Design a protein around this ligand. Structure first.
Ligand SMILES: C[C@@H](C(=O)N1CCOCC1)N1CC[C@H](NS(=O)(=O)c2ccc3cc(Cl)ccc3c2)C1=O
Ligand SMILES: [Ca+2]
Lengths: 234, 52
């Protein structure tokens, strides 16, 4: 996350972090339930063996809420493609259930039509992660969050040197220096409605981080609600 | 009109059925007696920042 702020105690409880063999985060995730994590398909090529950590805000100290979980099943979208990042979505079933507590709770899954007409037309969503703090800076040791405006679809298509498919949406700023960045991929994009937070996006890609005339691109969760439901029953 | 007017007074999801607003809630909430508000069924309901 470039810019924004630290998540304060209890403010981003649905954040998950995918960790490599060396216990280093390389991608984010969203807690959907006691057994399921939402992440990006492209993240499943960034490591051979990985685990999921939840309840963490400072990767430099033991806060007492942290829990590491093993993955029982990786469910990647079968139409995902590396050339365009179309269908950039995966669901993970954990070996053991997540015990909810302070800093550990799920985000809500919305219904499609309501989310698209009511959530996706709000001014902003919120993105979060332990990712890079500069286009070529080091990763954050602190979980951060950032309010990102929804961006007009036509304007987004005009600014992009890469195809924006029906399974993607744009959010962020034209020139202001705030954006998601490397290592935030797979992480939550949530929308607040009457003090309840619903999953609306997954951190997917972007031409650098926070560049002038460029926006952050997210997987459009609302187009995947039936697929997510199927994956979570099996 | 209906759901386009302040979300039809619904706490969460709003749907129109035969010129009428129908409210509903995410999994883990139950629709209150007034047919509009959403009540958590147990601890740590989805979508809420944690306070304990
Ligand atoms: C253009 C794109 C890319 O290589 N793609 C391959 C083909 O499909 C489009 C994505 N790039 C180029 C570099 C960039 N990597 S990154 O700086 O680590 C990164 C990753 C995810 C991001 C997500 C957001 Cl929302 C914003 C900035 C990001 C930056 C990235 O995702
Ligand atoms: Ca910690």
């Amino acid at each position: 996350i470039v810019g924004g702020q630290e998540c304060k105690d209890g403010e981003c409880p649905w954040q998950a972090l995918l960790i490599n063999e060396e216990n280093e985060g390389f991608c984010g995730g969203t807690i959907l339930s006691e057994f399921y994590i939402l992440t990006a398909a492209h993240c499943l090529y960034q490591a051979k063996r990985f685990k999921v950590r939840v309840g963490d805000r400072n990767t430099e100290q033991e806060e007492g809420g942290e829990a590491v979980h093993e993955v029982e099943v990786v469910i990647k979208h079968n139409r995902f493609t590396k050339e365009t990042y179309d269908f950039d979505i995966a669901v993970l079933r954990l070996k053991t259930p997540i015990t909810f507590r302070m800093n550990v709770a799920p985000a809500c899954l919305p219904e499609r039509d309501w989310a698209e007409s009511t959530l996706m037309t709000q001014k902003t969503g919120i993105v979060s992660g332990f990712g890079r703090t500069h286009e070529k800076g080091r990763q954050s040791t602190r979980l951060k969050m950032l309010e990102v405006p929804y961006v007009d679809r036509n304007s987004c298509k005009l600014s992009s040197s890469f195809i924006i498919t029906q399974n993607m949406f744009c959010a962020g700023y034209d020139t202001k220096q705030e954006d998601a960045c490397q290592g935030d991929s797979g992480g939550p994009h949530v929308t607040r409605f009457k003090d309840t937070y619903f999953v609306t996006g997954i951190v997917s890609w972007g031409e650098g981080c926070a560049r002038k005339g460029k926006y952050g691109i997210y997987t459009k969760v609302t187009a995947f609600l039936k697929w997510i439901d199927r994956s979570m029953k099996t | 009109k209906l759901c386009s007017l302040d979300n039809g007074d619904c706490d969460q999801f709003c749907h129109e059925e035969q010129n009428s607003v129908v409210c509903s809630c995410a999994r883990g909430y139950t629709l209150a007696d007034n047919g509009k508000a959403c009540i958590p069924t147990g601890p740590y309901p989805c979508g809420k920042q944690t306070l304990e």
